[PDB]
Amino acid sequence: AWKNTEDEILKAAVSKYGKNQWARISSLLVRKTPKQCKARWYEWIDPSIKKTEWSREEDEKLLHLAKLLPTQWRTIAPIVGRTATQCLERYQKLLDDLEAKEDMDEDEKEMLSEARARLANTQGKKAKRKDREKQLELTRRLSHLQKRREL
Amino acid sequence: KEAYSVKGRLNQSQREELALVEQAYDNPHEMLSQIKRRLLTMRTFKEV
Amino acid sequence: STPELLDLLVKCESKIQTRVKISLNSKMPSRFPPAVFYSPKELGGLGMLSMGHVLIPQSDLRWSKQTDTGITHFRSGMTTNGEHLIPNLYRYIQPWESEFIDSQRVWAEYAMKRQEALQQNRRLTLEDLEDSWDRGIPRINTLFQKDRHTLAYDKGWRVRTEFKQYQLLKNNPFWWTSQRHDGKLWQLNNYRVDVIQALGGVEGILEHTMFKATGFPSWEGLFWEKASGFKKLTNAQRSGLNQIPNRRFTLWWSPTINRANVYVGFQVQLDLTGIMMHGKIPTLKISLIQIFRSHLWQKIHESVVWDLCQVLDQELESLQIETVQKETIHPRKSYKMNSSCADILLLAAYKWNVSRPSLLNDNRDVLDNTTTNKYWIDVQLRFGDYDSHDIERYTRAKFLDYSTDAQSMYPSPTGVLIGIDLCYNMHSAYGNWIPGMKPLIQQSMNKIMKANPALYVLRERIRKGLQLYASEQYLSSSNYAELFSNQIQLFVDDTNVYRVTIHKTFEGNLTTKPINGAIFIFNPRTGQLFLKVIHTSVWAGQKRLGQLAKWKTAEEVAALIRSLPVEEQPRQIIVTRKGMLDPLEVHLLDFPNITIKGSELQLPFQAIIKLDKINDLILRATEPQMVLFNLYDDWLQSVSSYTAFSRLILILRALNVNTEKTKLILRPDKSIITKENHVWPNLDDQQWLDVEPKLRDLILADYAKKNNINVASL
Amino acid sequence: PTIDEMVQEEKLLNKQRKYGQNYEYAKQIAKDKTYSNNLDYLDENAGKLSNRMKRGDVSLAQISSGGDLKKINHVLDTCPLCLNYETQPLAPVISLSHRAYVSLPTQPELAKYHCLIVPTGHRINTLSCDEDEWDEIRNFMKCIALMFDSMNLGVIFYENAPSPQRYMHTAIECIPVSKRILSLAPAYFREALSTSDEEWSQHRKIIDTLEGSKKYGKWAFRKMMVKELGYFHVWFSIDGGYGHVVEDEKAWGRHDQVPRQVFASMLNLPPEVIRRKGSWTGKKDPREDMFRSRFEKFDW
RNA sequence: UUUAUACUAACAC
RNA sequence: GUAUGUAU
Ligand SMILES: [Zn+2]
What we know:
Chain C: This is Pre-mRNA-splicing factor spp42. By secondary structure, chain B is mostly helical.
């Protein structure tokens, strides 16, 4: 499916962790799996992809490599530059046709709040348990010092 | 099927496969239809 | 044919044993018993089939067996047999050349039969093919393979499976073949058999195990159970949890593993017990503790000594005993070994000329070899190795030790000691014997062994560990004479309780409704009944009511024994069906003295509802009623009991006989009028002998109708 | 403590098959938290790992029901047959015995006159049935057989209960097959049963009641085979049969196939019939009506 | 009286 | 609910 809600946490996720980790992200997405979470990134979401526009004169050489290789579509992508081999296959599927003719709302809001907790705090178990020890010791004194004034 | 009958534990992708496996058993002609379509059109495949 | 392969196949078979070998104990066994590895799975073995040659040592085939007439020793090696090595694998595999030669012969032989069948114009039969089953490299069994119509369209398979090794990372030894196209290319059947006989038969193996300690009747029909083994456990826990089944295996071979010849170790006694661990073997140390988990050792010693006092007080008049006194037991005497003070002291009124100590069970025993006037009893519990289960030699040493020893403070230098093993469930005594004592302690121990609660607890606790299930004496012709003794008994017949009449729905879907039924408890002395009538309503609005009703009957059978006074309570309850023992023993555990039996008889308690007054009254009965019937009228005035029991059993059978035309023979019998305050008719001694044959003739008619076969031998 | 008291504790456990000394051992490891899996450590603890039997209780209320309440009741509430006053089955049903009945199978269907005997009570393994209830099944067997004897056919029946932990009903199904194809079946199964499961098992593949019936024809199956654990069983005539006990059920077949694949070969059908799916539902007259009228002539 | 969260969990299947 | 530390 892949709706907007998904992608806007994913973009925030990669900024957080790094594109190397993927199963940390697919936990926070719930219904997505680190293969899809990674896969769907290299096709679409990232900045390096060129979503918009396709410039005719640069494009008549993109259908030229198909004459050379025939299939082989992943070696074509780094040359053609537009990448996202899906669209590089779909673009040559445009021009070859023309030549011849002539709960769910609620569950989305839950994951969107859980993600705001993950991004917010990095302290870990040791930070939380060490501060409680300070909080106990400080709170212990305030009762202990009142005993001294009482006496 | 051979792959997973032996193994005591199963993993995500295996869990995923067995459903698609079991779904195919139930109704073949619908799965046949999808196989033929997969050949004709598709040329780019997921990371192996 | 190579040496290089056959000096792996040894070293690698050893590498694998040494895996197991380690996971029981770290100090590494000097030797090990080979039964444990090579014995088939169905006797608690691993099943692992060897290449190379394993010299089974002779000392690991001896085994014992105990009847009440003695203890027979056996030697599988002493007899003139083939040299005792574990059989090789190769000798049960047709070497290729042969197979290849036979295959083309066989498949021609099939081409002969199959074409000559089509020349006859008559299809091929199973009879001819049984000649050649496990032959042909496509084995002919592959023709009868299920998927033959679908595998016909499979093709190029042999390549697939070679390549499959790149598809998934599971190293597959059967790659070169397939089981569906080539069939089983190997048969081991006759390997298993010939391994057993090399290990000393089922007995030779089973000796090594704790089969005897469980005390089941015979191996014949026994059982094994398979368990799996939630919370987040992590790593080190899941390893220990996968090795749960493994723990049992140690228990079942404990007798042959835990001995001096297997572990040249420090023999430390396990605490609170008489056992000895030779190694450390922690998997075994735990599961023995878990069995002797209260103070079970002490309690077995006391439970035996306590149930010797209760036999010797009743029969003291015959032995002419002055006083029977049980000594004060020290708390740790039960499981000490270097010392043992006597538990039961006795005296004699007259005199008692005995005999150099002998053995109990054995036939010929001498009676004039010594002279005394006193004796004592001291029981010794003893957990046996495989290397030492002879109690005869054990006790023998103990007397000769403790008799002449100056430190041991027995009263006289003349007495008796009883040896008892719990691992092999054996017993004997090398003491001073007398006419009267010999047959007493024979009978009394053989009862004690089968009777005691302490030894029954032990045997259940072991089976809890082994998880070894199975499939009092049953009723024979001798048990008929016993059931008409002075002892009160019962015949509980929960056949009746659940029945349904047929209801047809308006639509109407077929449906069932239940008709009140009688909890039939039949006395073998009084000849009365304790019928319980159960209302439909209890049945109503319930689920799984077939099993419920069986529980509901046993609840009210125990409630009837409570209502009966302590004088009139039964001694031995008997049930028709074997399934009834499970629910009934939960209520009768509060009354533990009663012996609950199972039977093999086809007792005729099916024909009871066929009496007309029982149908009329119970159909009318609108509440649960504790009714009391008499199935002997006042026969006791004229006809005796024993004979009348065989009569009404014959007459109850006889209402299932010509179904409802044996009762229809009793209806024109009007002169013999039935009494008004009683059930049966008033048949005289001649009319009993006229009723007997009529019913016996018609009975064997229905056995001829139902079971085909007419009249056979008596 | 006390011996007479201790005997009572042992018999109570005997009925509760789920909890014994293996669960107290397995519980103690999860509870221990610190547990290194060695021989050095397992000895240093020793007593600490066996110690338990304090929390165990319940007595009669536990055993009377058995196999949990929540699990069996959920099975019983859904169970699509079980004949009571309250509940009416989903199967159409033909002839009702006192503790059993004949009914038609699911929609895929193996043969034109394919049927199944079903006990009224929740029996599972047909070895757990009462000897009183079994006698009704025998009269059904002979009449059904004699029905197909006039058709010149004969019948092979079977039952498949690889897992009684699931706690399902057992339906002994009748399969009409010709006599020349019937005589081959002894081979087919004997291959399938030995092949199907891994052959390091203890129980030994194949257990013939056909030879046992010559020793005791009334009950060979009931005597030989065991109820408690898994199992599978075919038979020819009244009291013939081949018998195999199932282990590693995951390997066997969760949806019923090892036998159905053998009939899919022996009888020879398309590869779409092999798997049985669908439901009983109700009021399916046109197919089950043709069987009733035919069956009533031979049926007591 | 209803809903959520955590602690009770040194629970149970 | 211990492994491990804080207070009397
Ligand atoms: Zn049911």
